[model samples]
Target: FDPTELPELLKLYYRRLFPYSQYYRWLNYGGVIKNYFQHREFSFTLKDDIYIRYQSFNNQSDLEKEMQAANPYKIDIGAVYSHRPNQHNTVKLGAFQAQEKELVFDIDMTDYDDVRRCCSSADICPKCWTLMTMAIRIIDRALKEDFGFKHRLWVYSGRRGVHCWVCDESVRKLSSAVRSGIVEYLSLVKGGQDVKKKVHLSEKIHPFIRKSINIIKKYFEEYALVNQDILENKESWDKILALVPETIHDELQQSFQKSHNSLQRWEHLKKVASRYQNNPWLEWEIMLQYCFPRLDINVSKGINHLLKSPFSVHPKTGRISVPIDLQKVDQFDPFTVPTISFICRELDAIRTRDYKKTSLAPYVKVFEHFLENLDKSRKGEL
Candidate 1:
């Protein structure tokens, strides 16, 4: 069965998307277009696509298994993509949350400190997703503002929503200083420390927000742009449209004035308490529920129990909050972060340049230290 047959919000499609150099012999021979079979469609079939997907894995053991299985089509396409963990040409993407594994839309309180917000396996957590989105936005802003690059985007990531791949050469030259600076900028904005007296916090979001991150380009094309005009004119997000007669003005602003839509745990507890009896935070209500005669304070008791226990900590800062930092950035295992170990693996693979000898097996190896160290001082299962 085609995975795309399911009613998923995300769709996957493939074009002749590759980044081979112009100086290559293929380029001299009319590029990838030289092959009519490739350009005109036979290679674009399900089998060919399956073949391409097969190459991403460690010699298609899973693919062979699928063939041998009773119902091979009964598989998770997204899971298949995740299993590949390509550090080569394959790009990672997300919508709503980058770490989102399920077809869900969650509105919750997950920030730097809150860890363990999503499933340990199967489902992607919203907290991890925010970090990925932050990275995507950082990369996007860097291309536009720092490197003077331009691009467009595709909504599909082979199996997920919105895969953005930049086709600009400028980004290739981005120094490590620039990369680290992007991370630093993301951190500063995340912390409430960088807001100026008069500057609107929303304006600072230009460097790292999801909306702008969606613009990516698969093919290289020249386009004129004005950095100062687009940046300084915050009131008018106007861009010249060659396809149209007039300039298009976009005014969707990014907010940095604190995530107005914060999912605070204390508030959640209060709400849950309020819905059941009232005054969930009040110790009187808690006592009345637990010790009171004929009082059905089960929910309140649960809240009280939770309050007594430590909430999740911020992932990035390691500070405990009532509900925990949203998907505690610092709490997440660094090696588990997509680009972290993936980048390291790619580096190792590139060193060898042999797919068969890429040595990715070691990279996928899970370290028990990761789990053991997670809740070292915290009050929960490690």
Candidate 2:
């Protein structure tokens, strides 16, 4: 089925099928105080590109009603306001901006344009998709290991990438300046396109960067050398050689020419680099520049920046932006993510089953598990 029928399908899914109890619980932020729901901003994109923003709800029933009525093609989760977001026009000027939001991360496949060989631009293939898998693994680990955040939600962008929402109360309450500092702590690769070297390492690398490198090392053999074939030819070798010092550049280039494959060439380059004191560290830096996560820093550094809400549908592709199960990160494939039409089709077949309600059953369960954990935490059980 195509996207033409998405409106009616979404109406059924959201109104009758969506677990509003759980959804409300997730976004209501524990209803810690009065009008928590009222201040949370939900933006919608309606049919024919009609866009509406600052949509707030008085209650769960009202939110559900408005969503069903609009049949929004896309939904974005913005910041929770200090006052009612809908009342921003009437509220005091400085009073209406974002007060608190989850510390979020957005990693798009296009950002890996320099390293991926299978796809470019907005296109994605399984080979390049591994970059996303590795990215989630690396970031998820850091969020927990370094920052002590337990409530992290990973969501597929429904097209080309993933977004992370760190929903722990402490993380959500972080100031923009503090948020930028946290992002800076996690970010190792810096500089823009004009800058030849992005990741600069001191004699003593940060533990976080070292840990990230260990993760990248696990995937680089298959991801870069085999899939990307970075040393297969002189052109590819030249790209890598540019990152190495001139002292070893000609030697490594000659070694790459004699080696039978990228793997053998990489080994030879590593062996050659080992002969020098600091060259091995430079080799590691080159690998990271090619494979480490390329984050959209602005997304993580701002408190007001909005990210597409989990379970929102992509207008162009008709795919549901599902919550990613970090436990199954390696097996998670974006191409297999269900579309609105596909889920509706399965909903028809599973009409007799209530618990296994929609084709979205598995993904929704993943989200529900997260909410369940949050519920426990709210009760001081976790």
Candidate 3:
């Protein structure tokens, strides 16, 4: 399960156990278009930093053959085209352009740079990864509740982020304008560094904001107040105080001054907020601003945005970007996610040469389960 063994392991993964059938079914968009498989765009980053884009395949076997031959270190999936992506060089710009794609969301931990005190840049620890889990909880509920999307696929980006692909037919066919509207609807925290108030809530919060706050509240105590120590330092304390009314702000400043730690200071501030009958949930809003999900809105707004495919290997970590099971997402630990080398090791431990019956069986089985759920929905059975 190390870097030295990654190449051979990836070759074995591509050649023997890539689950081409499920992958094709997931990407083909229910065969609604002619040559759907052939027109879908795939990009690969091979060994030695060799990059290949605009790749398309006529069939599952062809895709498997080409991928095995190329031995790509990473794979990215893009929008399905009106024309063959492979032949795009010969076609006119608008004529060969992208048509349909899953409504995607890209949440990178680096976006939480100002809020997270645990880690910075591409580095992620378990404490900071809680932000990702919170994002999934909030966004997934909103997708199901607000938009009515059923067959969404959540994938670990294999690095410091997560990508969610909303695969409902109506969602996939949505125009760029509608997609931009959806991104705007989901994004509440506005303004950059200079802006003191990121989340501006009215006296009566909307149901979506209330729902998102409920999700944020579940993790805020540990994530921000404890882990981030938001109240211990004057800089962070000021950020939280600026969100509340002046009356409560003055009280919280005094309370925080007397408090020994972040936990005590937070409790003192919460008490002050709860005392106000008009805005009993004011503290919840502050907590939401400190820990809510910050998405890359451009990725979601563009119909042609290319997202890294699930099952693609991350070049630096050699970890496979796999589908996240929402049922068990709360227990999903990124550190325990299987790597290409780890899967190969598991395959080698098998007594028999039967690839179908090894420990790798569970991973493929999980993927098949997702495809089954998707296929059932495609047929109006789910």
Q: In terms of TM-score, which candidate is strongest? A: 2
Q: Residue 345 lDDT in model 1?
A: 40
What would the TM-scores of all predictions be? 0.22, 0.95, 0.92
Candidate 1 vs candidate 2: which has greater lDDT? 2
Better-scoring candidate (lDDT), 2 or 3: 2
Top candidate by lDDT: 2
**2 or 3, which is superior by TM-score?**
2
Task: Report clash pairs, candidate 3.
Answer: none
Model 1 C-alpha lDDT per residue in residues 1-382, reported as the tens digit of each score: 2223321201110001001121121111223223211211000112223422222222223322322331121111221122233332444354111111111111221222112223333234433333333333444455457655443121111111122222222432344345345334433222222321111123233433323323311100111012112122323222111111121111112321122322222233234334443311231222111111111122111210111111111222222111111124234332232221222344444411232232222221211122222224132342
Clashes of each: 23, 0, 0
> lDDT, candidate 1, residue 125?
43
Question: lDDT (0-100) at residue 255 of candidate 1?
Answer: 25
Window of ten residues with lowest summed lDDT in model 3: 351-360
**TM-score of candidate 2 relative to the true fold:** 0.95
For residue 2, give model 3's deviation from the true position in Å: 4.0
Per-residue CA lDDT of model 3 for 224-262, tens digit only, reads 877778887788798788888788778788888888999
